[PDB]
Scaffold this active site. Structure first.
Site, PDB file in Angstrom:
ATOM      1  N   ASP A  25       1.109  -7.357 -16.232  1.00 26.64           N
ATOM      2  CA  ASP A  25      -0.140  -7.440 -16.990  1.00 26.64           C
ATOM      3  C   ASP A  25       0.039  -8.095 -18.358  1.00 26.64           C
ATOM      4  O   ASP A  25       0.434  -7.448 -19.337  1.00 26.64           O
ATOM      5  CB  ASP A  25      -0.732  -6.034 -17.158  1.00 26.64           C
ATOM      6  CG  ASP A  25      -2.150  -6.064 -17.682  1.00 26.64           C
ATOM      7  OD1 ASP A  25      -2.729  -4.983 -17.823  1.00 26.64           O
ATOM      8  OD2 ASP A  25      -2.678  -7.162 -17.937  1.00 26.64           O
ATOM      9  N   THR A  26      -0.292  -9.378 -18.443  1.00 23.75           N
ATOM     10  CA  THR A  26      -0.183 -10.103 -19.703  1.00 23.75           C
ATOM     11  C   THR A  26      -1.225  -9.663 -20.727  1.00 23.75           C
ATOM     12  O   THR A  26      -1.092  -9.966 -21.917  1.00 23.75           O
ATOM     13  CB  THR A  26      -0.288 -11.621 -19.491  1.00 23.75           C
ATOM     14  OG1 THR A  26      -1.562 -11.964 -18.905  1.00 23.75           O
ATOM     15  CG2 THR A  26       0.856 -12.083 -18.585  1.00 23.75           C
ATOM     16  N   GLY A  27      -2.259  -8.959 -20.268  1.00 26.31           N
ATOM     17  CA  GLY A  27      -3.289  -8.408 -21.152  1.00 26.31           C
ATOM     18  C   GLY A  27      -2.991  -7.012 -21.680  1.00 26.31           C
ATOM     19  O   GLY A  27      -3.862  -6.385 -22.306  1.00 26.31           O
TER      20      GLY A  27
HETATM   21  C1  LIG Z   1     -10.202  -3.912 -11.111  1.00 23.47           C
HETATM   22  O1  LIG Z   1      -9.835  -3.434 -12.410  1.00 23.47           O
HETATM   23  C2  LIG Z   1      -9.538  -4.368 -13.479  1.00 23.47           C
HETATM   24  O2  LIG Z   1      -8.969  -5.423 -13.225  1.00 23.47           O
HETATM   25  N1  LIG Z   1      -9.951  -3.939 -14.666  1.00 23.47           N
HETATM   26  C3  LIG Z   1      -9.883  -4.547 -15.978  1.00 23.47           C
HETATM   27  C4  LIG Z   1      -8.878  -4.008 -16.982  1.00 23.47           C
HETATM   28  O3  LIG Z   1      -9.251  -3.147 -17.754  1.00 23.47           O
HETATM   29  N2  LIG Z   1      -7.612  -4.453 -16.891  1.00 23.47           N
HETATM   30  C5  LIG Z   1      -6.479  -3.851 -17.582  1.00 23.47           C
HETATM   31  C6  LIG Z   1      -5.502  -3.308 -16.536  1.00 23.47           C
HETATM   32  C7  LIG Z   1      -6.194  -2.304 -15.635  1.00 23.47           C
HETATM   33  C8  LIG Z   1      -6.653  -2.692 -14.379  1.00 23.47           C
HETATM   34  C9  LIG Z   1      -7.291  -1.774 -13.547  1.00 23.47           C
HETATM   35  C10 LIG Z   1      -7.463  -0.459 -13.964  1.00 23.47           C
HETATM   36  C11 LIG Z   1      -7.004  -0.067 -15.217  1.00 23.47           C
HETATM   37  C12 LIG Z   1      -6.365  -0.985 -16.050  1.00 23.47           C
HETATM   38  C13 LIG Z   1      -5.779  -4.840 -18.518  1.00 23.47           C
HETATM   39  O4  LIG Z   1      -5.299  -5.967 -17.774  1.00 23.47           O
HETATM   40  C14 LIG Z   1      -6.668  -5.389 -19.622  1.00 23.47           C
HETATM   41  N3  LIG Z   1      -7.029  -4.417 -20.664  1.00 23.47           N
HETATM   42  C15 LIG Z   1      -8.010  -5.101 -21.546  1.00 23.47           C
HETATM   43  C16 LIG Z   1      -7.911  -4.758 -23.017  1.00 23.47           C
HETATM   44  C17 LIG Z   1      -7.113  -5.517 -23.866  1.00 23.47           C
HETATM   45  C18 LIG Z   1      -7.037  -5.205 -25.220  1.00 23.47           C
HETATM   46  C19 LIG Z   1      -7.765  -4.134 -25.738  1.00 23.47           C
HETATM   47  C20 LIG Z   1      -7.682  -3.823 -27.194  1.00 23.47           C
HETATM   48  C21 LIG Z   1      -7.673  -2.509 -27.654  1.00 23.47           C
HETATM   49  C22 LIG Z   1      -7.599  -2.269 -29.023  1.00 23.47           C
HETATM   50  C23 LIG Z   1      -7.530  -3.345 -29.901  1.00 23.47           C
HETATM   51  C24 LIG Z   1      -7.541  -4.644 -29.399  1.00 23.47           C
HETATM   52  N4  LIG Z   1      -7.618  -4.850 -28.077  1.00 23.47           N
HETATM   53  C25 LIG Z   1      -8.576  -3.385 -24.889  1.00 23.47           C
HETATM   54  C26 LIG Z   1      -8.649  -3.697 -23.534  1.00 23.47           C
HETATM   55  N5  LIG Z   1      -5.869  -4.000 -21.367  1.00 23.47           N
HETATM   56  C27 LIG Z   1      -5.566  -2.707 -21.545  1.00 23.47           C
HETATM   57  O5  LIG Z   1      -6.250  -1.790 -21.124  1.00 23.47           O
HETATM   58  C28 LIG Z   1      -4.337  -2.435 -22.371  1.00 23.47           C
HETATM   59  N6  LIG Z   1      -4.781  -2.394 -23.745  1.00 23.47           N
HETATM   60  C29 LIG Z   1      -4.161  -2.989 -24.758  1.00 23.47           C
HETATM   61  O6  LIG Z   1      -3.115  -3.629 -24.663  1.00 23.47           O
HETATM   62  O7  LIG Z   1      -4.819  -2.838 -26.043  1.00 23.47           O
HETATM   63  C30 LIG Z   1      -4.450  -3.668 -27.148  1.00 23.47           C
HETATM   64  C31 LIG Z   1      -3.599  -1.147 -21.997  1.00 23.47           C
HETATM   65  C32 LIG Z   1      -3.245  -1.161 -20.511  1.00 23.47           C
HETATM   66  C33 LIG Z   1      -2.312  -1.059 -22.825  1.00 23.47           C
HETATM   67  C34 LIG Z   1      -4.429   0.094 -22.297  1.00 23.47           C
HETATM   68  C35 LIG Z   1     -10.884  -5.600 -16.422  1.00 23.47           C
HETATM   69  C36 LIG Z   1     -12.112  -4.828 -16.908  1.00 23.47           C
HETATM   70  C37 LIG Z   1     -10.352  -6.421 -17.595  1.00 23.47           C
HETATM   71  C38 LIG Z   1     -11.287  -6.542 -15.293  1.00 23.47           C
END
Ligand SMILES: COC(=O)N[C@H](C(=O)N[C@@H](Cc1ccccc1)[C@@H](O)CN(Cc1ccc(-c2ccccn2)cc1)NC(=O)[C@@H](NC(=O)OC)C(C)(C)C)C(C)(C)C
Lengths: 99, 99
Positions: A25-27
C-alpha cells in the site's frame, strides 16, 4: 518482481512466526496488521484513514519478511479489515512505482 | 517515471481544467478526490476504509491527466484528507509496483 494493479497487490508476509496475506500500500504511511498478540512493549496510537481514526498498538523493531525480502520496523496492530504494508517497510525492500 | 517511497508519492493531476496534488495509492480500489464540483450527473455511493464508511458522489467517465498520462474513468468525490488516485486509474496509465 513486478506487480500489476489489475487486482489488489496482495503478497505473502512472514511475521511473529505466521504467514499472512498483506496489501502492498503506497497510500499508507504506516504498516497496520490485523489483531494479533505479539510479545513485547507497545504504545497506544490513533491512526486515521478514510472513515476516521482507530486505536492501534504500536510495536517497534518487528522483523517482517515480504515476498522473501527481509524488513524490520514499526508495526501497528488493530481492527483493520486487511493487513497493510505501508511505506515504512516498502522502502526497505526497494519498492518503487513505475509508469 | 520511477517514484520512490521515502516520501508520499504525491503527483500533480489535471482535472476539470484544474491542477491538484494527488496520492498514487496501490491500496485503493477506487479514486477519491476532495470535495469539488465536476460536470455531469453523479450518483451517491458509499465506500469504506479504515475508520469506516463515508458517502461519496460517483462521477463516471471523467478524464484525468496524471503526470502527463491520460486516464478516463470513475472518480469519487467526498470527505477525504488527501486526493487519492486508485487502481482503477493507475492501471490505465500502466503503473506497476517493482522491487
Ligand atoms: C475496497 O477498499 C479500499 O480500497 N478502500 C480505500 C482505502 O481506504 N484504502 C486504504 C487501505 C484500505 C483498503 C481497504 C480497507 C481498509 C484500508 C489506503 O490505501 C488509503 N488510505 C487513504 C488515506 C491516506 C492518508 C490519510 C491521511 C490521514 C491524516 C493526515 C493525512 N492523510 C487518510 C487516508 N490510507 C490509510 O488509511 C492509511 N493512512 C495514512 O497513511 O494516513 C496518513 C493507514 C492505512 C495508515 C491508516 C479507498 C477508500 C481509498 C478506496
Amino acid at each position: 518482481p513486478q506487480i500489476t494493479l489489475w487486482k489488489r497487490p496482495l503478497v505473502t508476509i512472514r511475521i511473529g512466526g505466521q504467514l499472512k496475506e498483506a496489501l502492498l500500500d503506497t497510500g499508507a504511511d504506516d504498516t497496520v496488521l490485523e489483531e494479533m498478540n505479539l510479545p513485547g512493549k507497545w504504545k497506544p496510537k490513533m491512526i486515521g484513514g478514510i472513515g476516521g481514526f482507530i486505536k492501534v498498538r504500536q510495536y517497534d523493531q518487528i522483523p517482517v519478511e515480504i515476498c522473501g525480502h527481509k524488513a524490520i520496523g514499526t508495526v501497528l496492530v488493530g481492527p483493520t479489515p486487511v493487513n497493510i504494508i505501508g511505506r515504512n517497510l516498502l522502502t526497505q525492500i526497494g519498492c518503487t512505482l513505475n509508469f
